[PDB]
Structure formats: structure tokens, C-alpha cells
């Protein structure tokens, strides 16, 4: 049961910025990033099948 | 007589700035400074008492 066995947490989407400290008069550099995470909920609401 | 036995000279007050060469997309840096000076005037215009 996925709606209570594992949760996904969203904080901030991706962004792009120009790095001035490295952008010389003959080169260009860019930076990007985002923040997200996830954690497990109920451990009893799931099952897994494997070859024995 | 301090007004002639010692002088204080000031050139520029304090200031604050942000250093763009170190400010990446994940850190910040600040810089500040000031300039001051002082010199001894008439030597004989003062006295000092000490234990002997």
C-alpha cells in the first residue's frame, strides 16, 4: 500500500545561476541544484518476492 | 594639556561590502575596513607619576 508505505517530500525545484567568480572574459560557467528527499512509513504494509 | 600634547587624525570612516569573487551560489563573503592615525605633539606638555 504505497500511500502509507513510503513518502516522498518535495522542498524546492531546480534552478540555474551564472558563476561570476569563474566567468572570465573568455570562459563561462553555470551552476544548478535542487533539494528533495524521502523516507519510509509503515514497514508492515509491503512485501517483496525473490527467487529462492 | 592634551589638546596640544596629543593629536588624533581620521581619514575615512568604516564601510561594508560583499565580495563577488567568493560569493558562489552556496556561500557568501563580506569585507570591511577603515583608516585612522595619530601622533604625539608637544612632548613637554605632559607629566607622569610613578612609584619609586
Amino acid at each position: 500500500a504505497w500511500k502509507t508505505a513510503y513518502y516522498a517530500v518535495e522542498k524546492r525545484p531546480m534552478f540555474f545561476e551564472q558563476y561570476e567568480g569563474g566567468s572570465s572574459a573568455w570562459c563561462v560557467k553555470y551552476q544548478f541544484g535542487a533539494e528533495d528527499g524521502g523516507f519510509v512509513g509503515c514497514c508492515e504494509h509491503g512485501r517483496v518476492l525473490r527467487i529462492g | 594639556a592634551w589638546k596640544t600634547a596629543y593629536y588624533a587624525v581620521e581619514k575615512r570612516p568604516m564601510f561594508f561590502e560583499q565580495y563577488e569573487g567568493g560569493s558562489s551560489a552556496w556561500c557568501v563573503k563580506y569585507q570591511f575596513g577603515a583608516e585612522d592615525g595619530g601622533f604625539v605633539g608637544c612632548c613637554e606638555h605632559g607629566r607622569v607619576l610613578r612609584i619609586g
Binding site: F39 | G22, C27, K29
Partner: protein, 135 residues
């Protein structure tokens, strides 16, 4: 009112002066050290910080120790060899304690041991604390 603080902020021995004990930080999301002295010191005592990976044979037993890698902060110094360490000075009094923690988590277990074993080493005690449970 007193409280059962150990329920939310447990603590475990790390260095008792004779043996070093692995501490499992996997189950908690934050942690930190605490140092105390029990007698006057003669010379400074530096400590090495390690971490362990789960043994390939059994996930309940830690593997061999691995030195923690140093990380520079927002600006400035870095370690000479790039490996984190801690040093306790002489000026520290007998009736006080010290606190410090690494910035990075790394492996599920953590550990600490002195650089060299001597009389001064046994005169120190180290305990670990964890701040948040997640299981």
C-alpha cells in the same frame, strides 16, 4: 519535573581510556561528541576519527575502520593530509567538558581512537550523543 531524557537523546560510550567501541549512527539523523578529562594531563592528546561499512557477511556487525575524509568549510583552512582529527590541549581544566562534531555523516557507524596509546591517553573519556530517531 524530571524527565526520561534517554528516551529521546540517548548516549553511548566511545572511548573509555582502554578500548574503543563502534557507535551506530545509522538509526539517528544527528549526533555529536563530548570530551571530558579525569586527571591532569602531561602532553596534548590527538584523536583519529573513523567510520565503518557493514560487513559483507552480516549486516549487524561493522567492517574494518576507515579514516574520515576532511572537508573545508565555507572558506579557509584545510588539513595537511586531508583527514579529520581532534586535539585536546593542556589548558583544559579537570572540571569541564568539550564538544564537537564532524560536518559529514559518511558510513553508518562511527568510531574514535587516539593517535598513540600512552599514559596521557587513558586520562580522557569520550561519549557520543544522538539527537533524532528515524526508525
Amino acid at each position: 519535573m524530571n524527565f526520561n531524557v534517554g528516551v529521546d537523546f540517548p548516549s553511548f560510550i566511545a572511548w573509555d581510556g582502554t578500548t574503543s567501541f563502534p557507535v551506530k549512527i545509522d538509526g539517528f539523523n544527528q549526533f555529536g561528541f563530548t570530551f571530558k578529562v579525569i586527571e591532569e594531563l602531561t602532553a596534548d592528546v590527538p584523536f583519529n576519527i573513523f567510520y565503518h561499512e557493514a560487513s559483507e557477511a552480516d549486516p549487524c556487525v561493522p567492517g574494518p575502520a576507515i579514516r574520515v575524509p576532511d572537508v573545508p568549510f565555507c572558506d579557509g583552512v584545510a588539513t595537511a593530509d586531508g583527514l579529520a582529527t581532534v586535539v585536546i590541549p593542556e589548558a583544559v581544566a579537570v572540571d569541564s567538558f568539550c564538544a564537537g562534531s564532524v560536518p559529514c555523516f559518511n558510513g553508518p557507524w562511527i568510531s574514535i581512537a587516539p593517535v598513540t596509546v600512552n599514559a596521557d591517553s587513558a586520562k580522557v573519556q569520550v561519549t557520543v550523543t544522538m539527537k533524532g530517531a528515524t526508525r
